Amino acid sequence: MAIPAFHPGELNVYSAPGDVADVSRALRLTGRRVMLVPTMGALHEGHLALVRAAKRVPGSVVVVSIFVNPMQFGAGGDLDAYPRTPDDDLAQLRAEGVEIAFTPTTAAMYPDGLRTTVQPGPLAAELEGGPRPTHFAGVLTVVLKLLQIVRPDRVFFGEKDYQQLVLIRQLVADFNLDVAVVGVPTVREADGLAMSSRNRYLDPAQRAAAVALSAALTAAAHAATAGAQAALDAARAVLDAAPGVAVDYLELRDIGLGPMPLNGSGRLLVAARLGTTRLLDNIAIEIGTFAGTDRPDG
Amino acid sequence: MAIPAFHPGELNVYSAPGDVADVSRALRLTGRRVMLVPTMGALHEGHLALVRAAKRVPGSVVVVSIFVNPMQFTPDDDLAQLRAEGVEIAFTPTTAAMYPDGLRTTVQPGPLAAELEGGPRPTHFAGVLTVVLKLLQIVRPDRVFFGEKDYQQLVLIRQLVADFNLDVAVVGVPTVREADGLAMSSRNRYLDPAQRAAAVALSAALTAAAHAATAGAQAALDAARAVLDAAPGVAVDYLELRDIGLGPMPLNGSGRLLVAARLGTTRLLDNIAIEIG
Numbered sequence A: 001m002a003i004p005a006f007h008p009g010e011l012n013v014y015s016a017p018g019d020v021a022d023v024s025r026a027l028r029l030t031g032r033r034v035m036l037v038p039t040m041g042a043l044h045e046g047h048l049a050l051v052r053a054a055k056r057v058p059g060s061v062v063v064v065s066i067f068v069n070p071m072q073f074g075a076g077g078d079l080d081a082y083p084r085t086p087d088d089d090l091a092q093l094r095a096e097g098v099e100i101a102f103t104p105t106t107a108a109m110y111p112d113g114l115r116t117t118v119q120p121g122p123l124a125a126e127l128e129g130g131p132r133p134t135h136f137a138g139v140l141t142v143v144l145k146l147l148q149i150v151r152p153d154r155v156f157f158g159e160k161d162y163q164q165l166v167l168i169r170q171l172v173a174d175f176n177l178d179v180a181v182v183g184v185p186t187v188r189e190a191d192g193l194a195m196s197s198r199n200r201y202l203d204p205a206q207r208a209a210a211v212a213l214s215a216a217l218t219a220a221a222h223a224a225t226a227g228a229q230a231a232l233d234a235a236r237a238v239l240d241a242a243p244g245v246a247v248d249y250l251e252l253r254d255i256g257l258g259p260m261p262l263n264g265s266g267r268l269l270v271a272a273r274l275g276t277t278r279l280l281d282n283i284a285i286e287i288g289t290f291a292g293t294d295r296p297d298g
Numbered sequence B: 001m002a003i004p005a006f007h008p009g010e011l012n013v014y015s016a017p018g019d020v021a022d023v024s025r026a027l028r029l030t031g032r033r034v035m036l037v038p039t040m041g042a043l044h045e046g047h048l049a050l051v052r053a054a055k056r057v058p059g060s061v062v063v064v065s066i067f068v069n070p071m072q073f074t075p076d077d078d079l080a081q082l083r084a085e086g087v088e089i090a091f092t093p094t095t096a097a098m099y100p101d102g103l104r105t106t107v108q109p110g111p112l113a114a115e116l117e118g119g120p121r122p123t124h125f126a127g128v129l130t131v132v133l134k135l136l137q138i139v140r141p142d143r144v145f146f147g148e149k150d151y152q153q154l155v156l157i158r159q160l161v162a163d164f165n166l167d168v169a170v171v172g173v174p175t176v177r178e179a180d181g182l183a184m185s186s187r188n189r190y191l192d193p194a195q196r197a198a199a200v201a202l203s204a205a206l207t208a209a210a211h212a213a214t215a216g217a218q219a220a221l222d223a224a225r226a227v228l229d230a231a232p233g234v235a236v237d238y239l240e241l242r243d244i245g246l247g248p249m250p251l252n253g254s255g256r257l258l259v260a261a262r263l264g265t266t267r268l269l270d271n272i273a274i275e276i277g
């Protein structure tokens, strides 16, 4: 009762929040499980893995949102006119059998400018948040809004942007949101580079050196049998051997981004600049007496 | 795993957020409309009026949450009143249940929160909006009911709902008043009989202003000031005429006149609808 056109088995594209909210609600009433994949477009194989994870849930209908949230741009930073490929985007979604694309305007998302917003916890001031102190407020505000509009049963995020994922789990816990946050392992290029829409920014020399991030992390994960100092120093030596790579941070944390014990299990996160382009990556890691395995570590 | 225990036409009291969310989901699916009445307990005729408004919605089940929110500003007596009112659900969470991770992700209100009541208390409304978002997420009501007495708060809640695209109706219920017109409040018990007699000046100023308003905005404001000037011991923090969303009052039209004042140590608030000329 009030439903926009909806063609099942087809990609249906809605800009109006109200429209996708009424479609999502009707679909929920028929007992389909609504899955949300929030994106900023320029879709790559990583996003497709998110869509495929969502597709695997029985009864799933998949909503992919595409919205370049200005409240996570720019000055300073981040300073890029973000890649926009709306045509290819929807043709990828079609091929994958996604039924809903939500592509709102800025005016429909922010009809009152920045008025009520989400204040993230103090994790948002660390790491990615240090130099850009309101960035995560912008992520968590738009993600809360997407969740209220679409009301999915689960929402799917890549693990690459690991701080953002943790903060979104924080959001969902803290506001009692009735949604499951699904983190999906990072899709990588063949040489190990974490997929990102911003990888296309890299010139040839830079694309070649950028392999050092994933090579560092992988080297660290295997060095870690010998402890956290070995893991870190192995990662930093790889990073230092790559020309044109400038390290922002290289840090060990627990899975929730608290302190890492030595001899435990956690995450190693890295951010670096190549010319003007910032890259992130992270890996699961186990250190010391926690890194023993049947065979060779780890 | 079973839907938790719900006994229709009795008062069902849940302390676990999970419990209430489950029960409310179940009923929304068995064809009830879920109504939420958020309270801090110490219930009075004012809250019962919120209760009665909710009850009247056909097919309603009424959820009355009772939570004293540390981030903001008598158990078995409250539950008595609700049972007597035919309230089917009371939600009575603990602080640890509401805040297991302490103060982490919170709501940041827009600039309205730094004004009027937010001048004395600049983080009051952040706590209010945060708990209200949480209660709305836990109960998912069709409609949420608030008194108009805390009008700035009501307006902020409507900002929350619009801004976070919450799909709930916010229902403001006209302020219940004592026979002399004093807006009902918990704080009215504080008042010695002199403060209590002097307290009538707030509602009297506002209704005099409402009626003076046929002669314009200055007439309305001057009438309210005269009435307040006639009261001893009433320290007026503000008296402001605004539009109904608490922006600038238009030239003429519909607005809201708001007052706050201190009597000894009790801070009292009131507001009224005003139609200019």
Ligand SMILES: COc1ccc2c(c1)cc(C(=O)OCc1cc3ccccc3o1)n2CC(=O)O
Pocket (backbone or CB within 6 Å): A038, A039, A040, A041, A045, A046, A047, A049, A050, A139, A143, A157, A158, A159, A160, A161, A184, A185, A186, A187, A194, A195, A196, A197, A198
């Ligand atoms: C699982 O394999 C991968 C590997 C890398 C991945 C993904 C999947 C997905 C992304 C991604 O960013 O999506 C865009 C986005 C949506 C969004 C919504 C709210 C806030 C921030 C947001 O950022 N990326 C990184 C990238 O494209 O640079």
Ligand SMILES: COc1ccc2c(c1)cc(C(=O)OCc1cc3ccccc3o1)n2CC(=O)O
Pocket (backbone or CB within 6 Å): B038, B039, B040, B041, B045, B046, B047, B049, B050, B069, B128, B131, B132, B146, B147, B148, B149, B173, B174, B175, B176, B183, B184, B185, B186, B187
């Ligand atoms: C329309 O008739 C009236 C008249 C006066 C009224 C009410 C109704 C309601 C209240 C009231 O405060 O309820 C408690 C409350 C709970 C809560 C939870 C989260 C946020 C804010 C919140 O405020 N009062 C004033 C009072 O009793 O202090």
